[PDB]
Amino acid sequence: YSNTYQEFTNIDQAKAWGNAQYKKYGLSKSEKEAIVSYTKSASEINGKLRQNKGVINGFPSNLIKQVELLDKSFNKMKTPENIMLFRGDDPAYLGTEFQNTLLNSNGTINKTAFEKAKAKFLNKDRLEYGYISTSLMNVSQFAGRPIITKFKVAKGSKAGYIDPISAFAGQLEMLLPRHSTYHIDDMRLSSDGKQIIITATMMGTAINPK
Numbered sequence: 001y002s003n004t005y006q007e008f009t010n011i012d013q014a015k016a017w018g019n020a021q022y023k024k025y026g027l028s029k030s031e032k033e034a035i036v037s038y039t040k041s042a043s044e045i046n047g048k049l050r051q052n053k054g055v056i057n058g059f060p061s062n063l064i065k066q067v068e069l070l071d072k073s074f075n076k077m078k079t080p081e082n083i084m085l086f087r088g089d090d091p092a093y094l095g096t097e098f099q100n101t102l103l104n105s106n107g108t109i110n111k112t113a114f115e116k117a118k119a120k121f122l123n124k125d126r127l128e129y130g131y132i133s134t135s136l137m138n139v140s141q142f143a144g145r146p147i148i149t150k151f152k153v154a155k156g157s158k159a160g161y162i163d164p165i166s167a168f169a170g171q172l173e174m175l176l177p178r179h180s181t182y183h184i185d186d187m188r189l190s191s192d193g194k195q196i197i198i199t200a201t202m203m204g205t206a207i208n209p210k
């Protein structure tokens with residue numbers, strides 16, 4: 001009785017579709033500028049959100065301003081379809097105990113590592129303190145990366161196609177709000193054993209200004 005999530009297979013129409021959503025956002029200059037700032041320093045911002053468990057009161061004032069603009073910009077940015085979104089991650093994504101432990105010399109993932117990954121994460125909620133940068137398709141940015149997550153994001157969910165707002169956004173980037181929880185439904189290896197494939201249902205964000 002599973003739901004159907006669309007996967008984009010046609011880059012040209014993936015951009016048309018994203019552009020088409022974007023043209024309806026009606027974002028302010030300030031919200032566009034905050035998105036641009038996020039794309040320029042995303043690893044730093046998400047790193048601070050993580051270290052501080054989503055509490056932003058201690059961040060520098062200009063950053064607080066940008067984060068609250070970004071959080072509120074999602075009021076304007078929803079997906080009108082059930083869509084699958086992709087990202088690729090490095091071993092530390094699973095925990096620091098996995099950082100230097102996951103792969104083999106051939107470049108296949110370690111079965112015993114992978115087995116540890118599941119007991120820890122399979123069939124469990126995960127809260128993400130940072131924003132979640134994803135792509136509308138499985139773009140080349142990844143493919144090197146040993147972990148691919150496919151998020152199932154339901155109609156009406158907060159999700160912003162930011163690729164046209166910032167030249168430093170990922171190809172077909174779809175940004176998800178920070179402080180989101182998702183449920184990991186499935187973890188399996190790729191066919192050529194180079195990748196752990198994670199399928200998760202996005203449950204949504206705790207940040208709802210309004």
Ligand code: VO4
Pocket residue numbers: 028029030031
């Ligand atoms: O230009 V703003 O109205 O986003 O301050």
Ligand code: VO4
Pocket residue numbers: 059060061062
């Ligand atoms: O010291 V500040 O939070 O105004 O950068």
